[PDB]
Design a protein around this ligand. Structure first.
Ligand SMILES: *Cc1cc2c(cc1C)nc1c(=O)[nH]c(=O)nc-1n2C[C@H](O)[C@H](O)[C@H](O)COP(=O)(O)OP(=O)(O)OC[C@H]1O[C@@H](n2cnc3c(N)ncnc32)[C@H](O)[C@@H]1O
Ligand SMILES: COc1ccc(C(N)=O)c(NC(=O)Nc2cc(Cl)cc(Cl)c2)c1
Length: 454
């Protein structure tokens, strides 16, 4: 059904990612038409003498070669095929949609909006990411404190295991595979279908930004907002340079024709309870799609300046809320106190919205922060990348030296002792047992560098 390609442009694309550093080349790129084609290719890898590497590639947004299959085959999941319409279930008390694992979230959104004005409840900041790609990590943005990550908003999957078997799984059917695959770093199979939870979409968004010079007030306000009854629909934050540091609180209030009459007062009532710097509230009113696509708009401006296809040594940490104050002292004021620049995100989430049965690794605390160092290197300047990589190592050394129980999100670990420390004994045992069962020859997502063939 599918076709193997040796087109130099296809090989080149499959040999790189957004990080712009890892460059392991496959032998060929596979273009599947359906799940059976993926199953066929993985089955052939499983039965082969050498057991060649197979990795699914979503939109290639990995930072350190996680979707690369050195001397093997990269499955281009991007894909004429007919899409499933959203469905209502009286039993689940809501809607869902089945999507191909390679579908981009921006295309899922456009589809669900045009078919009943429905949308996923939990997002990433950037929608040109694949469903299977975010579901293999977590998929987080300003809605996760309330709805949980995208891995907490999926009902069912079809997975092609490392043995080339197509398996339908959910909480009630093959749950070990379902929960293993969710946040599973592509280690147990390729997601060919995901059943995404949907809600009736808002039409518009009241997008607010407010400034803080006091980090204690900033974090106290973020933590109070995520515990909220009247509440914001989105809670994020970012660190801003003086032109020493400021913190920007970023919130939204979603609304439609029915709630348009109460949005101004809901916002004013919520903002009144906060302690941001007076006169620093910036507001925008825009369609829901436009708000969700905000990072793609930043992307177009970077592409125009030749500032998009540069190295991205991005670092993402989950930091226990009990250690966030020390974190600002030694990192935002200490280590960072730049390259082409880029955002430094910071916002808390509620651990109870994350199912503990999944493969996702979070700190052992009820409230934890995402701290995202999204700094880009200068174009064609290798020394800028090297200086940023040294800064990233200083941040990790800071966490290690003061015993901050931080965990990397999209973990860039390479050594077995680093992976054992990341997971901890209980989670590592569960992870290794799932690998022995679903990918014994370690064919899948070998670019993650967790397992090697036996
Ligand atoms: C580049 C980028 C990334 C990003 C983001 C904004 C940008 C500009 N915003 C994010 C956000 O707000 N929140 C968040 O949670 N993540 C965000 N990211 C990171 C992004 O989630 C990751 O890069 C992720 O890997 C998804 O990206 P993509 O769709 O491109 O997937 P990939 O890089 O090619 O592959 C990642 C790993 O998963 C395996 N894989 C890929 N597809 C599948 C399927 N269908 N089934 C199973 N495994 C799959 C790859 O082999 C690789 O190991
Ligand atoms: C230059 O590209 C930009 C510009 C702006 C943003 C933003 N405002 O969120 C943006 N946001 C992200 O990339 N967020 C994101 C990126 C990763 Cl890799 C992981 C997670 Cl938790 C968040 C990227």
């Amino acid at each position: 059904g599918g076709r193997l390609s040796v087109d130099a442009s296809d090989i080149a694309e499959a040999s790189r990612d957004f990080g712009g550093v890892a460059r392991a080349e496959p032998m060929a790129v596979f273009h599947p038409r359906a799940a059976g084609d993926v199953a066929g290719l993985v089955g052939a890898a499983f039965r082969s003498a050498r057991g060649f590497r197979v990795s699914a590639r979503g939109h290639g947004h990995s930072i350190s070669g996680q979707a690369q299959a050195a001397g093997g085959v990269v499955v281009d999941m991007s894909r004429a095929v007919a899409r499933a319409l959203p469905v209502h279930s009286a039993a689940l008390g809501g809607h869902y949609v089945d999507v191909w694992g390679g579908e981009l979230w921006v295309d899922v959104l456009n589809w669900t909006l045009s078919h009943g004005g429905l949308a996923p409840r939990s997002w990433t900041d950037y929608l040109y990411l694949s469903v299977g790609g975010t579901l293999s990590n977590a998929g987080i943005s300003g809605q996760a404190f309330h709805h949980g990550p995208q891995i907490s908003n999926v009902y069912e999957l079809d997975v092609v295991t490392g043995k080339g078997e197509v398996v339908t799984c959910s909480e009630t059917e093959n749950p070990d595979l379902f929960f293993g695959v969710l946040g599973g770093l592509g280690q147990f199979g390729i997601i060919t279908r995901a059943r995404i939870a949907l809600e009736r979409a808002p039409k518009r968004v009241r997008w607010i930004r407010a400034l803080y010079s006091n980090f204690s007030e900033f974090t106290a306000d973020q933590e109070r907002l995520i515990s909220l009854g009247r509440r914001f629909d989105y809670v994020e934050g970012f660190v801003v340079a003086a032109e020493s540091v400021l913190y920007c609180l970023e919130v939204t209030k979603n609304y439609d024709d029915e709630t348009a009459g109460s949005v101004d007062q809901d916002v004013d009532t919520l903002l009144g309870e906060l302690n941001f710097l007076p006169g620093t509230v910036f507001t925008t009113d825009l369609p829901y799609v436009d708000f969700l696509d905000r990072v793609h708009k930043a992307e177009l401006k970077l592409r125009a300046k030749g500032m998009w296809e540069v190295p991205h040594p991005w670092l993402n940490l989950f930091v226990p809320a009990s250690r966030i104050a020390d974190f600002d002292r030694g990192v935002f004021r200490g280590v960072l106190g730049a390259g082409a620049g880029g955002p430094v995100l910071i916002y808390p989430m509620n651990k109870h919205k994350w199912d503990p049965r999944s493969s996702a690794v979070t700190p052992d605390e009820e409230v934890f922060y995402l701290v995202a160092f999204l700094r880009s290197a200068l174009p064609g300047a290798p020394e800028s990348l090297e200086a940023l990589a040294r800064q990233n190592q200083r941040i990790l050394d800071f966490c290690a030296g003061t015993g901050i129980g931080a965990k990397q999100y999209l973990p860039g670990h390479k050594a077995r002792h680093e992976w054992a420390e990341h997971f901890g004994a209980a989670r590592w045992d569960r992870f290794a047992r799932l690998k022995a069962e679903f990918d014994p020859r370690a064919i899948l997502a070998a670019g993650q560098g967790i397992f090697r063939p036996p």
